[PDB]
Amino acid sequence: TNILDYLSTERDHVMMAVRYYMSKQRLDDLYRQLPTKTRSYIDIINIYCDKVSNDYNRDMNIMYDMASTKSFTVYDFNNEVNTIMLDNKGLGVRLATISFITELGRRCMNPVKTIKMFTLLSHTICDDCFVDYITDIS
């Protein structure tokens, strides 16, 4: 329920800042120790899903509320996404999942459970179909 809540005491602010520092440095260095191939894929995914997230903003929130009001776990979700992937072979459904997962992430504050989800779901999302789409662009 919101963000300002967990930031109760002074310690919590400093502890958050330190934790944010570590995560941002690990991430920036990571980008730098990446091949230009990966780097370009990152560019492709970045504009597509930054667009999807922006164009279908309210559909993201709509799906967020659909996920809330029901007792729903990360795992059953991944499985559903996987079943979808087996028949829907469009690019759209994959991009939309990435953006929806990204929305789920922005709202969770546990970094550990969040990265687990990112990790599990990105496996599922990157089936052979999706990979073929990404490699064949610029």
Partner: peptide, 23 residues
């Protein structure tokens, strides 16, 4: 149950498809 979110996601995806296999 859960495929309500599933359907929604595919629907969005179909819109995304029709919008880049044209102008």
């Amino acid at each position: 149950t859960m495929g309500q979110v599933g359907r929604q996601l595919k629907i969005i995806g179909d819109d995304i498809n029709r919008r880049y296999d044209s102008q």
